[PDB]
Amino acid sequence: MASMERFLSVYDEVQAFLLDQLQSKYEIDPNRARYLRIMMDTTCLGGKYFRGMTVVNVAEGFLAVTQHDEATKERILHDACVGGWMIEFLQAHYLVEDDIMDGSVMRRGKPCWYRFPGVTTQCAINDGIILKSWTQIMAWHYFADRPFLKDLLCLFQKVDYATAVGQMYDVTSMCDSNKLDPEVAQPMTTDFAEFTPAIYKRIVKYKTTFYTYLLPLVMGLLVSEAAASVEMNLVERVAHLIGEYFQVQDDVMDCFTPPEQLGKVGTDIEDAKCSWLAVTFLGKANAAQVAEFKANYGEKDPAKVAVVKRLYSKANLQADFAAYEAEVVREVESLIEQLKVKSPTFAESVAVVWEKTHKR
Amino acid sequence: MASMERFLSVYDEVQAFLLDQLQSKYEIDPNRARYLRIMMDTTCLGGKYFRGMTVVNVAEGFLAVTQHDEATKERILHDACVGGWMIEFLQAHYLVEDDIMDGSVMRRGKPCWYRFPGVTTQCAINDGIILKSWTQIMAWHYFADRPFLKDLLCLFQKVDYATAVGQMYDVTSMCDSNKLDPEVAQPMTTDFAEFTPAIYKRIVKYKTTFYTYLLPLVMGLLVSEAAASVEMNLVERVAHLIGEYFQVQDDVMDCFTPPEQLGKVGTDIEDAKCSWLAVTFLGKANAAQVAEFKANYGEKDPAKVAVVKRLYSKANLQADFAAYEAEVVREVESLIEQLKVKSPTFAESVAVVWEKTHKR
Numbered sequence: 249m250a251s252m253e254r255f256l257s258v259y260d261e262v263q264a265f266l267l268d269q270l271q272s273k274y275e276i277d278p279n280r281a282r283y284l285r286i287m288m289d290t291t292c293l294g295g296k297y298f299r300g301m302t303v304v305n306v307a308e309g310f311l312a313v314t315q316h317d318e319a320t321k322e323r324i325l326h327d328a329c330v331g332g333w334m335i336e337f338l339q340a341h342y343l344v345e346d347d348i349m350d351g352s353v354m355r356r357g358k359p360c361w362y363r364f365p366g367v368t369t370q371c372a373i374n375d376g377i378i379l380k381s382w383t384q385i386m387a388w389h390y391f392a393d394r395p396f397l398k399d400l401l402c403l404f405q406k407v408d409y410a411t412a413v414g415q416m417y418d419v420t421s422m423c424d425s426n427k428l429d430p431e432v433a434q435p436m437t438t439d440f441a442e443f444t445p446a447i448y449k450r451i452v453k454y455k456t457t458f459y460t461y462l463l464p465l466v467m468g469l470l471v472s473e474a475a476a477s478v479e480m481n482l483v484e485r486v487a488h489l490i491g492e493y494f495q496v497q498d499d500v501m502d503c504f505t506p507p508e509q510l511g512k513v514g515t516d517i518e519d520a521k522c523s524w525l526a527v528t529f530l531g532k533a534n535a536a537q538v539a540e541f542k543a544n545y546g547e548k549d550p551a552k553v554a555v556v557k558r559l560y561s562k563a564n565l566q567a568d569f570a571a572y573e574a575e576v577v578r579e580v581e582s583l584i585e586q587l588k589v590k591s592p593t594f595a596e597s598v599a600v601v602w603e604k605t606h607k608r
Numbered sequence: 609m610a611s612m613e614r615f616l617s618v619y620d621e622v623q624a625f626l627l628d629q630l631q632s633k634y635e636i637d638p639n640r641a642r643y644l645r646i647m648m649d650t651t652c653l654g655g656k657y658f659r660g661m662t663v664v665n666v667a668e669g670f671l672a673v674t675q676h677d678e679a680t681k682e683r684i685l686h687d688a689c690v691g692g693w694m695i696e697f698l699q700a701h702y703l704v705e706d707d708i709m710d711g712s713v714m715r716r717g718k719p720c721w722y723r724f725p726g727v728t729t730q731c732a733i734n735d736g737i738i739l740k741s742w743t744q745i746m747a748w749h750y751f752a753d754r755p756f757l758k759d760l761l762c763l764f765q766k767v768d769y770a771t772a773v774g775q776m777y778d779v780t781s782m783c784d785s786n787k788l789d790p791e792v793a794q795p796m797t798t799d800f801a802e803f804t805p806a807i808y809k810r811i812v813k814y815k816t817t818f819y820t821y822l823l824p825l826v827m828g829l830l831v832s833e834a835a836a837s838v839e840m841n842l843v844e845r846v847a848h849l850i851g852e853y854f855q856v857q858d859d860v861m862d863c864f865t866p867p868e869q870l871g872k873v874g875t876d877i878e879d880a881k882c883s884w885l886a887v888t889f890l891g892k893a894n895a896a897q898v899a900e901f902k903a904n905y906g907e908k909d910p911a912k913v914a915v916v917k918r919l920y921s922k923a924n925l926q927a928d929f930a931a932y933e934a935e936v937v938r939e940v941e942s943l944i945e946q947l948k949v950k951s952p953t954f955a956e957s958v959a960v961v962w963e964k965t966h967k968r
């Protein structure tokens with residue numbers, strides 16, 4: 249069986265399990281079940297499944313080098329599929345809630361869930377809650393008797409909590425820290441003193457890298473009973489590094505990729521986000537350029553937005569990007585080498601994750 | 609040590625643990641830590657702590673009849689306090705998110721969290737997420753080596769998921785089920801065919817009873833290693849029964865308790881909620897009364913709201929309430945008796961929970 253067709257099949261099986269349980273154990277009626285089926289499909293399907301498929305790809309790597317009965321091979325692959333859906337549903341939770349938090353309009357060429365006419369914010373906040381609850385229902389059902397259940401739940405928790413803390417770093421990134429105060433409406437920064445590489449790195453490390461790269465890699469090791477084939481400090485280091493690069497690319501596309509190709513209208517400039525572009529621009533600007541940036545950033549006025557894009561264009565940010573990219577290629581190849589000492593197979597899976605990131 | 613002073617002390621200890629970890633493990637800065645300290649205090653403190661204190665009271669019951677070293681007595685009580693805070697933080701999560709979902713203005717005489725000037729919806733949805741993540745952090749830290757960790761996590765999950773499903777039942781209670789559809793804006797019901805006792809019971813069972821009554825009772829049994837002192841089908845039956853009564857009282861106060869005493873302006877009529885009052889009124893109304901109710905319910909116009917209150921007044925709903933109350937007194941005393949067969953101590957704790965509910 250090809251990997252993607254297995255993965256997709258297990259989605260149908262998990263969906264049926266979750267909705268059947270709603271009827272047998274939680275007293276749901278058929279119409280509300282249909283509403284939740286449609287919510288699940290709309291929010292969990294239609295991406296490339298990079299995160300969930302990484303679990304499967306890691307587990308396939310280890311199957312090629314480890315002796316097992318066929319039925320054990322099938323159970324491992326079924327577990328890797330379930331685990332990969334846990335991650336896809338976790339991402340679904342964060343996309344639904346973030347879209348509401350940020351007042352987003354589109355995602356992937358389609359309206360954000362909360363904007364569907366028979367959804368609304370009142371339902372969509374709760375639908376998002378349900379998405380994440382379903383990850384837990386999956387784990388407790390499919391992994392009830394598994395030796396890795398404890399470790400898997402404990403890892404999942406920490407990643408989820410890191411991700412929520414990262415959303416906090418993200419949404420407060422344009423405020424002055426010393427002015428955070430629940431009692432006082434928050435002004436945009438005027439000095440941009442906090443738009444630094446180290447601060448930017450903390451936002452991206454927490455908001456994206458834990459659930460996009462660390463979790464799929466480590467879940468693949470857990471369902472394979474292979475955590476001893478790695479030095480977990482290296483896996484964490486490589487995960488954060490690759491995931492930082494992934495976000496830098498996303499930051500650049502938000503500004504420069506046309507909307508029909510991007511699948512939405514990017515608003516990072518208007519939203520005054522601490523993007524890689526803003527931070528890099530500030531790291532090389534002269535006094536007059538910094539003043540012009542300050543007079544135009546974080547404003548909805550499209551002429552002021554065009555002024556910011558113009559500043560980024562004139563500033564030759566493509567060169568700082570190629571230099572960044574060069575250095576990440578360097579450090580990732582180094583980390584992969586360190587991974588080969590305990591597991592060529594795992595190092596190869598990390599290689600594949602890097603290639604899919606670097607070339608998308 | 610008195611129970612409440614222990615409980616309160618453990619809040620300070622848990623808070624310090626959670627914020628210290630944010631600094632040592634999640635790279636937080638002092639200002640964001642202060643923001644989260646204030647969020648925790650504002651959202652978790654100021655109620656009566658009925659749910660968390662019930663864990664402690666159940667555990668105290670068993671301590672009186674079970675032999676233990678003093679250090680074991682202290683560990684059980686510390687565990688019951690932590691467990692009771694897990695429940696209080698879980699309720700905090702649902703209050704923050706529900707207030708946003710329902711566009712609530714006040715809670716307990718104070719603005720809803722999302723309405724604080726330096727919060728806003730964009731932060732408050734995520735703050736609510738964090739609240740529930742903190743319940744998990746507590747359990748994995750304080751109960752890491754405990755024999756009941758698995759059972760406690762598995763119970764907590766199911767209760768949380770029941771609660772989210774109950775919010776779904778609640779927010780869709782004024783729609784016709786056969787018309788639920790993410791693609792189509794949802795009209796209010798015109799026939800009110802779904803305002804029935806059984807439908808009402810399903811909303812309340814899921815939305816409130818699992819986290820308010822089942823969870824504190826069962827968590828008390830788990831931290832005491834006492835689940836064998838009960839027949840879990842009875843505990844579930846009594847929990848749902850008491851919790852249904854609790855919500856019927858809440859439904860009546862939303863309509864009839866003055867706002868300064870209620871701590872908010874009740875809007876169940878304007879929001880077309882399936883309340884006990886609406887369902888009971890419809891169960892006894894003549895044709896003309898049903899037509900007048902239909903012409904006035906679910907409308908913000910205060911004259912139409914006063915028409916609905918007038919219908920409920922003339923309909924002598926206080927008599928149906930006294931009759932309901934009588935029957936619940938009857939069934940609860942019966943269930944307590946059945947609980948005495950395996951545990952007088954546990955039956956007594958259930959007695960106390962009932963008294964606090966019945967007389968508030």
Ligand SMILES: NC(=O)NOCc1ccccc1
Nearest residue numbers: 273274763766767770818822
């Ligand atoms: N639906 C129902 O009544 N019970 O299923 C959920 C559940 C919650 C807590 C403890 C055990 C089960």
Ligand SMILES: NC(=O)NOCc1ccccc1
Nearest residue numbers: 403406407410458462633634
């Ligand atoms: N903050 C950090 O870098 N690590 O702490 C969180 C964490 C997440 C996943 C696995 C293990 C730990």
Ligand SMILES: [Zn+2]
Nearest residue numbers: 346349350418
């Ligand atoms: Zn966002």
Ligand SMILES: [Zn+2]
Nearest residue numbers: 498499502516
């Ligand atoms: Zn972006």
Ligand SMILES: [Zn+2]
Nearest residue numbers: 706709710778
């Ligand atoms: Zn509500």
Ligand SMILES: [Zn+2]
Nearest residue numbers: 858859862876
């Ligand atoms: Zn109410």
